[PDB]
Write an enzyme that holds these catalytic residues in place. Structure first.
Site, PDB file in Angstrom:
ATOM      1  N   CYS A  31       0.808  -1.221   0.000  1.00 42.88           N
ATOM      2  CA  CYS A  31       0.000   0.000   0.000  1.00 42.88           C
ATOM      3  C   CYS A  31       0.836   1.263   0.000  1.00 42.88           C
ATOM      4  O   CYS A  31       0.528   2.211  -0.720  1.00 42.88           O
ATOM      5  CB  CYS A  31      -0.932   0.031   1.208  1.00 42.88           C
ATOM      6  SG  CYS A  31      -0.091   0.021   2.808  1.00 42.88           S
ATOM      7  N   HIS A 201      -2.358   1.911   6.930  1.00 44.25           N
ATOM      8  CA  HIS A 201      -2.627   1.719   5.518  1.00 44.25           C
ATOM      9  C   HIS A 201      -2.303   3.048   4.857  1.00 44.25           C
ATOM     10  O   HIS A 201      -2.354   4.094   5.515  1.00 44.25           O
ATOM     11  CB  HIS A 201      -4.104   1.341   5.353  1.00 44.25           C
ATOM     12  CG  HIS A 201      -4.536   1.030   3.948  1.00 44.25           C
ATOM     13  ND1 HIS A 201      -3.656   0.735   2.930  1.00 44.25           N
ATOM     14  CD2 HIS A 201      -5.778   0.938   3.409  1.00 44.25           C
ATOM     15  CE1 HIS A 201      -4.331   0.493   1.819  1.00 44.25           C
ATOM     16  NE2 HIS A 201      -5.620   0.598   2.083  1.00 44.25           N
ATOM     17  N   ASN A 221      -8.641   3.348  -2.932  1.00 42.10           N
ATOM     18  CA  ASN A 221      -7.962   2.260  -2.261  1.00 42.10           C
ATOM     19  C   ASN A 221      -7.223   1.503  -3.372  1.00 42.10           C
ATOM     20  O   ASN A 221      -7.409   1.813  -4.557  1.00 42.10           O
ATOM     21  CB  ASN A 221      -8.975   1.378  -1.533  1.00 42.10           C
ATOM     22  CG  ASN A 221      -8.331   0.470  -0.517  1.00 42.10           C
ATOM     23  OD1 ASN A 221      -7.133   0.582  -0.209  1.00 42.10           O
ATOM     24  ND2 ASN A 221      -9.124  -0.438   0.022  1.00 42.10           N
TER      25      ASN A 221
HETATM   26  C1  LIG Z   1      -0.460  -1.802   3.512  1.00 38.47           C
HETATM   27  C2  LIG Z   1      -1.804  -1.815   4.243  1.00 38.47           C
HETATM   28  S1  LIG Z   1      -2.835  -2.996   3.635  1.00 38.47           S
HETATM   29  O1  LIG Z   1      -2.154  -4.260   3.609  1.00 38.47           O
HETATM   30  O2  LIG Z   1      -3.295  -2.702   2.306  1.00 38.47           O
HETATM   31  C3  LIG Z   1      -4.004  -3.157   4.708  1.00 38.47           C
HETATM   32  C4  LIG Z   1      -3.851  -4.158   5.684  1.00 38.47           C
HETATM   33  C5  LIG Z   1      -4.841  -4.372   6.645  1.00 38.47           C
HETATM   34  C6  LIG Z   1      -5.984  -3.567   6.633  1.00 38.47           C
HETATM   35  C7  LIG Z   1      -6.135  -2.567   5.675  1.00 38.47           C
HETATM   36  C8  LIG Z   1      -5.150  -2.356   4.698  1.00 38.47           C
HETATM   37  C9  LIG Z   1       0.802  -2.089   4.361  1.00 38.47           C
HETATM   38  C10 LIG Z   1       0.637  -3.405   5.104  1.00 38.47           C
HETATM   39  C11 LIG Z   1       1.976  -3.894   5.656  1.00 38.47           C
HETATM   40  C12 LIG Z   1       1.830  -5.174   6.445  1.00 38.47           C
HETATM   41  C13 LIG Z   1       1.438  -5.132   7.791  1.00 38.47           C
HETATM   42  C14 LIG Z   1       1.342  -6.334   8.503  1.00 38.47           C
HETATM   43  C15 LIG Z   1       1.616  -7.550   7.874  1.00 38.47           C
HETATM   44  C16 LIG Z   1       2.010  -7.592   6.542  1.00 38.47           C
HETATM   45  C17 LIG Z   1       2.114  -6.396   5.823  1.00 38.47           C
HETATM   46  N1  LIG Z   1       0.985  -1.020   5.364  1.00 38.47           N
HETATM   47  C18 LIG Z   1       2.075  -0.230   5.330  1.00 38.47           C
HETATM   48  O3  LIG Z   1       2.953  -0.354   4.491  1.00 38.47           O
HETATM   49  C19 LIG Z   1       2.251   0.837   6.390  1.00 38.47           C
HETATM   50  C20 LIG Z   1       2.312   2.202   5.705  1.00 38.47           C
HETATM   51  C21 LIG Z   1       2.225   3.377   6.685  1.00 38.47           C
HETATM   52  C22 LIG Z   1       2.291   4.697   5.959  1.00 38.47           C
HETATM   53  C23 LIG Z   1       0.934   3.364   7.477  1.00 38.47           C
HETATM   54  N2  LIG Z   1       3.542   0.607   7.071  1.00 38.47           N
HETATM   55  C24 LIG Z   1       3.758  -0.519   7.767  1.00 38.47           C
HETATM   56  O4  LIG Z   1       2.869  -1.361   7.852  1.00 38.47           O
HETATM   57  N3  LIG Z   1       4.947  -0.748   8.363  1.00 38.47           N
HETATM   58  C25 LIG Z   1       6.036   0.243   8.329  1.00 38.47           C
HETATM   59  C26 LIG Z   1       7.364  -0.481   8.071  1.00 38.47           C
HETATM   60  O5  LIG Z   1       7.497  -1.487   9.083  1.00 38.47           O
HETATM   61  C27 LIG Z   1       6.553  -2.534   8.890  1.00 38.47           C
HETATM   62  C28 LIG Z   1       5.145  -1.998   9.125  1.00 38.47           C
END
Ligand SMILES: *[C@H](CS(=O)(=O)c1ccccc1)[C@H](CCc1ccccc1)NC(=O)[C@H](CC(C)C)NC(=O)N1CCOCC1
EC number: 3.4.22.-
Length: 254
Positions: A31, A201, A221
């Site tokens: 995301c 997200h 999204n």
């Molecule tokens: C995208 C969000 S999503 O997967 O599309 C989503 C998940 C659940 C509900 C709604 C949307 C990623 C998910 C990363 C993830 C998290 C847990 C397990 C596997 C994958 N989210 C991010 O990249 C966020 C971005 C920020 C700006 C909020 N960052 C993030 O999750 N991290 C930062 C780097 O360290 C790891 C966690």
């Protein structure tokens, strides 16, 4: 500048084909990179008077930005926009469109919602390698297909500031806190009501509006067209709902 009660980047800059595009992260927490390349695509077109009319490669940014976090396990917005400014990002469509330098390696799937694609399920792919190679039919060398920003910045956590930014320079990327009830979204104006945190997200704010006196942000999204409102959702605007006004990041090509 006076802010209109409604705004939609798709309607303001309709020559820019990326703005109306809904993408799909597939089985990968990318995301952070999709919100970025989408907004960068929109902005590269808007700010160049339609001279750049490209889809920027999610996989290039996801796979090659070393300072952007954990790839498919999640990322960080500031470094994503910095990478665009310093290194730039090549072109690349969805897997299914097979277009541009580096199309996305992963197929469309349903994200906690019903539809025609296979369910995504709970497993996540390994972050793709940084290949630095355009697909064989694309006759531009990888380094020469790079598109670069000039500046990047975080946007003030003020509603009018975010509105002026979108209206003047194009869609922004924005981080927000995702709670379990977000997974259940079908339509309407979202606010957090039930469920525990699922982390964060990153999405793309394209506009805003108001229905029955209820103000909202209009957002793309990156979970394909079957999720939510043909790929979009709306969320309460003006009350920093789920920190939606507090992690806005964008940038400019000039
Ligand atoms: C995208 C969000 S999503 O997967 O599309 C989503 C998940 C659940 C509900 C709604 C949307 C990623 C998910 C990363 C993830 C998290 C847990 C397990 C596997 C994958 N989210 C991010 O990249 C966020 C971005 C920020 C700006 C909020 N960052 C993030 O999750 N991290 C930062 C780097 O360290 C790891 C966690």
């Amino acid at each position: 500048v006076e802010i209109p009660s409604s705004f939609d980047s798709r309607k303001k800059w309709p020559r820019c084909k990326s703005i109306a595009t809904i993408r799909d992260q597939s089985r990968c927490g990318s995301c952070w990179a999709f919100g970025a390349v989408e907004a960068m695509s929109d902005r590269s077109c808007i700010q160049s008077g339609g001279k750049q009319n490209v889809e920027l490669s999610a996989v290039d940014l996801l796979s090659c930005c070393e300072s952007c976090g954990l790839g498919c396990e999640g990322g960080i917005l500031g470094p994503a926009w910095d990478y665009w400014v310093k290194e730039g990002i090549v072109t690349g469509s969805s897997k299914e469109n097979h277009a541009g330098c580096e199309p996305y390696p992963f197929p469309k799937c349903e994200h906690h919602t019903k539809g025609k694609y296979p369910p995504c399920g709970s497993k996540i792919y390994k972050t793709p390698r940084c290949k630095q190679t355009c697909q064989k039919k694309y006759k531009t060398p990888y380094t020469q297909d790079k598109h670069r920003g000039k500046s990047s910045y975080n946007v003030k956590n003020d509603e009018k500031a975010i509105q002026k930014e979108i209206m003047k320079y194009g869609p922004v990327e924005a981080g927000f806190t995702v709670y379990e009830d977000f997974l259940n979204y079908k339509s309407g104006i979202y606010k957090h009501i039930t469920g525990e945190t699922l982390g964060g997200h990153a999405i793309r704010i394209i506009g805003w509006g108001v229905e029955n006196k209820a103000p909202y942000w209009l957002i793309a999204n990156s979970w394909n067209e079957d999720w939510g409102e043909n790929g979009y959702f709306r969320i309460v605007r003006g009350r920093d709902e789920c920190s939606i006004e507090s992690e806005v990041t964008a940038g400019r090509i000039n």
